[PDB]
C-alpha cells in the first residue's frame, strides 16, 4: 500500500523491478535516484504521476468503462449552441494529449504554493478554476467597434482549445474577442481531462445571469417595444456554458459524491454538488444561492414612457433555464439532464422546494393576446408570424399595437435595431382577431452581425385604460445544409474518398467560396481550396481523396467561408480497422 519494489526476474547482468505507488500521492514531475552503501546517489530517470479513474482506492474512480472512454480518453467533443428551440452541434477538438499541454498545465499549477494539498482533486480544481478565470479576464479583448467584413472571417473561427491555452499563457498568437467568451468552460474541461479528472461541458439555455442570489430580474422596454438604454446588472442570457467534474467529496457530509459544477465568482472559484442545487441546501456553500437563482427565477417588465415613469404591464410568462442538454455517452446524440437540476413542473416536491426557499429568503386585464412565430428564419429569407387578440367586455374598444424586431448578442447585449411597426385595431362584441404578417430579410434597417439572435416584441395598449399587454420571442437564423457522403468503414493505409455538397438557398450568387478540411488521424493540420462563383439556383459539389493512418473511431471536419456567410462547419465520423494480414 506504500512505496515498494520487488525483483520479479533475475538475470546475470539485469534485474526486473516492479515498483508500487501509494494510492494517495502528490502529482507532478518525479525523479528516481539510487544510493550505494559507499558511493553517492545517481539519477536514473524522470517520470510523471497522474490521477486515474481505474483504481478502486483513488478518490476519482469510475465504475463504468464506457463512461471512462467518453469522459477521459476522448478528444473529440460536441458543444451545443443556439436557442432552446433549435440546437446546433459544433465539433470541438479538446486535444488533451498534445505534446506541450501537460507541461503548460503543470507549470501553471506550480503557482499555488500549497504543495501538500496537491493530493486532493478539490484543491486542484479550485486553483485551476480561479487562475483560468483570471486569465480569461486579463487576456480577452473587446470586439472591434469598426465595421470590417473582409477580416470578419478570421475573428470568429476556432481551431480548438490548445491554441487558446497557448495564446493565454504566452501571448504570442491570435487573441480571442468578446464574441466568443464561453470557451472558458471548454478550456477548463480540456485541462481537467489532461490532468486525469473526468469532466464535461454542459450548456444552460435561457439562463438569468448577472444578479447574485436574487430571484427577480428587472427589465425595461420602450414605448415602441424596444429597449431604452443599454445593459443591466442582471439580464437574461441566450445560453451559458459550465464545466462539470466527476469526483468524490470526503470533506463534506455523506451523500454528495459525484458530479460537481464549477462556478467561478467575479478571484476565487469553487465547485458545488448537483444534488445541493436540486434539493436547495443554501447554507452549505456561498455559491449555492447564486446557482439556484440561475435555474428558477422570475422576471418583471416595466414600461417606460416619454414622461419617464416605469409602468408594470401584463406579460406572458417566459420560461427560464429549461432543456439543459449535453453530449450523450458512447454516441453522437444529445441528452437532456434537466431532471438532475430541477423537479418536474406541476409536482408536489417542486412546490415544496419553492415554498421552503421563499420561507428561508423572507428571513434575510379585459383582453389578452398570444403570438405564434416560426422556430427558425432562413438566411436572406422570410417568415410569417401571427398575433391574436381576445377581449372580454360588454362594449367595443380600440387598441394600439406596436411590434419591434432587433438583434441581440448571446449575453443579452443589444446589437442593432432592425424593424418597427405601429398600427391601430378595434374590437367589438368580444370577437377574437388574428393578424398574420410576413417579415422579410430585405426590410431591416441594416445588416445584422455575425453571431446575433433576433428578438421580436409585441405590445398592445388599451385606449381608455392604462395597463397594456406584452409578449416577446427569440429566433435564430439558420444556414444552408452542408451534406457529407462517405463510407463508414475503411482499411488502414488505403485511399478513401469523401463528397461534400451544398445548395444555394440565398437570393444572391456566391463569391470567394473557400472550403477548408481537417481531422485528427486522417489528414495533417488543414487543407484549403477555392471554388468558382455559385448562382442562387445551382448547387456546389466537390470530392476529396486521402488516406487514414491511425486505427479507431475518427472524424473529419469541413468548413465553408464566402462573402454572404462565414464559418459554416460540419463534421462526419468514420471507423477504421487494421489491415488484413
Amino acid at each position: 500500500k506504500w512505496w515498494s519494489a520487488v525483483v520479479e526476474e533475475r538475470d546475470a547482468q539485469s534485474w526486473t523491478i516492479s515498483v508500487t505507488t501509494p494510492a494517495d500521492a502528490v502529482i507532478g514531475h518525479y525523479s528516481l535516484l539510487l544510493q550505494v552503501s559507499g558511493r553517492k546517489q545517481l539519477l536514473l530517470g524522470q517520470f510523471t504521476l497522474l490521477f486515474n479513474p481505474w483504481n478502486r482506492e483513488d478518490a476519482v474512480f469510475l465504475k463504468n468503462e464506457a463512461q471512462r472512454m467518453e469522459y477521459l480518453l476522448n478528444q473529440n467533443g460536441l458543444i451545443y449552441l443556439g436557442t432552446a428551440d433549435c440546437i446546433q452541434a459544433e465539433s470541438w477538438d479538446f486535444g488533451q494529449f498534445e505534446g506541450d499541454v501537460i507541461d503548460l498545465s503543470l507549470r501553471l499549477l506550480s503557482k499555488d504554493k500549497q504543495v501538500e494539498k496537491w493530493s486532493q482533486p478539490v484543491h486542484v480544481a479550485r486553483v485551476l478554476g480561479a487562475l483560468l478565470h483570471f486569465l480569461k479576464e486579463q487576456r480577452v479583448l473587446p470586439t472591434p467597434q469598426t465595421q470590417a467584413t473582409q477580416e470578419g472571417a478570421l475573428l470568429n473561427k476556432r481551431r480548438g482549445s490548445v491554441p487558446i491555452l497557448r495564446q493565454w499563457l504566452t501571448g504570442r498568437g491570435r487573441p480571442v474577442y468578446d464574441g466568443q467568451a464561453w470557451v472558458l468552460a471548454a478550456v477548463a474541461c480540456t485541462v481537467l481531462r489532461c490532468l486525469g479528472i473526468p469532466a464535461r461541458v454542459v450548456t444552460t439555455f435561457a439562463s438569468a445571469q448577472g444578479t447574485g442570489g436574487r430571484l427577480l430580474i428587472d427589465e425595461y422596454y420602450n414605448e415602441e417595444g424596444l429597449q431604452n438604454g443599454e445593459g443591466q446588472r442582471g439580464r437574461i442570457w441566450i445560453f451559458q456554458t459550465s464545466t462539470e467534474c466527476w469526483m468524490t467529496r470526503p470533506a463534506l457530509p455523506q451523500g454528495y459524491d459525484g458530479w460537481q459544477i464549477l462556478h467561478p465568482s467575479a478571484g476565487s472559484c469553487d465547485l458545488v454538488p448537483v444534488r445541493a442545487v436540486k434539493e436547495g441546501t443554501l447554507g452549505l456553500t456561498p455559491a449555492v444561492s447564486d446557482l439556484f437563482a440561475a435555474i428558477n427565477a422570475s422576471c418583471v417588465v416595466w414600461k417606460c414612457c416619454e414622461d419617464g415613469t416605469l409602468e408594470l404591464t401584463d406579460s406572458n410568462t417566459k420560461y427560464v433555464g429549461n432543456n439543459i442538454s449535453t453530449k450523450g455517452v458512447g454516441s453522437d446524440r444529445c441528452e437532456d439532464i434537466t431532471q438532475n437540476y430541477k423537479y418536474p413542473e406541476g409536482s408536489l416536491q417542486e412546490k415544496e422546494v419553492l415554498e421552503r426557499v421563499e420561507k428561508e429568503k423572507m428571513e434575510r386585464s379585459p383582453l389578452y393576446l398570444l403570438l405564434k412565430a416560426p422556430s427558425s428564419l432562413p438566411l436572406r429569407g422570410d417568415a410569417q408570424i401571427s398575433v391574436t387578440l381576445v377581449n372580454h367586455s360588454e362594449q367595443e374598444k380600440a387598441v394600439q399595437l406596436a411590434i419591434g424586431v432587433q438583434a441581440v448578442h448571446y449575453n443579452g447585449v443589444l446589437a442593432a435595431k432592425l424593424w418597427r411597426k405601429k398600427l391601430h385595431l378595434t374590437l367589438s362584441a368580444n370577437l377574437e382577431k388574428i393578424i398574420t404578417i410576413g417579415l422579410f430579410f430585405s426590410n431591416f434597417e441594416r445588416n445584422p452581425p455575425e453571431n446575433t439572435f433576433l428578438r421580436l416584441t409585441a405590445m398592445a395598449t388599451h385606449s381608455e385604460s392604462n395597463l397594456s399587454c406584452f409578449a416577446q420571442e427569440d429566433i435564430a437564423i439558420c444556414r444552408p445544409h452542408l451534406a457529407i457522403k462517405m463510407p463508414e468503414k475503411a482499411e488502414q493505409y488505403q485511399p478513401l474518398t469523401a463528397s461534400v455538397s451544398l445548395q444555394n438557398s440565398l437570393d444572391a450568387p456566391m463569391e470567394d467560396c473557400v472550403i477548408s478540411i481537417l481531422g485528427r488521424g486522417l489528414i495533417h493540420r488543414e487543407r484549403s481550396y477555392r471554388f468558382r462563383s455559385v448562382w442562387p439556383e445551382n448547387t456546389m459539389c466537390a470530392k476529396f481523396q486521402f488516406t487514414p493512418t491511425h486505427v479507431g473511431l475518427q472524424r473529419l471536419t469541413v468548413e465553408v467561408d464566402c462573402n454572404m456567410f462565414q464559418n459554416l462547419t460540419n463534421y462526419k465520423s468514420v471507423t477504421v480497422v487494421a489491415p488484413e494480414l
Binding site: 506541450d100 507541461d103 480548438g160 504566452t170 491570435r174 493505409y493 484549403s528 491511425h550
Partner: protein, 154 residues
Amino acid sequence: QMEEPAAHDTEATATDYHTTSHPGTHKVYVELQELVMDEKNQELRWMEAARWVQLEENLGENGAWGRPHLSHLTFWSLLELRRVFTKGTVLLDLQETSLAGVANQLLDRFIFEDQIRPQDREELLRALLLKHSHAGELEALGGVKPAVLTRSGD
C-alpha cells in the same frame, strides 16, 4: 459534371500550430540509401551507400567501407539543391511511427501542391515500399547495379 476543386496556400491559421516544447540538443547520424538492382533475381531494392558518423565514409563494390574523410561536395549540387529547395515541401512535427503512413502523407502533400500528377501516386507509393537492405546481405545478394523506375513497373 463532377469537377474537381483547385488548391490554395494560405497562412491565416499557421500560428495555431506553433508548439512550445524545447527541442533540446542531439547529435546526428546520417545514412544515405538509393534504389539498386541485383543481378541474382531482377527486383529493385533500397541499398545503403554512405554514412556520416564523424567523417564521411563510403561503401565499396566488394562490400567494405572505405576511408573516412571530410565532406566534399560540388557546385552543381548546391545549385540544384537550392533550386529544388526554393519550392520544396515541408511536414514539420508529424505524428507518425511507421513508413507506410509517412509515405502516404508525403504523396498526398505532393498531390496537394501540384508537385506530381494524380496518376503518379501509385507508382511512387509502390517504389517507396521496397525492401531496405543492409551491408551484411551484399555477399548474399551477389552484387547490385543502379536502376530507374518505370510506369509499367519493370
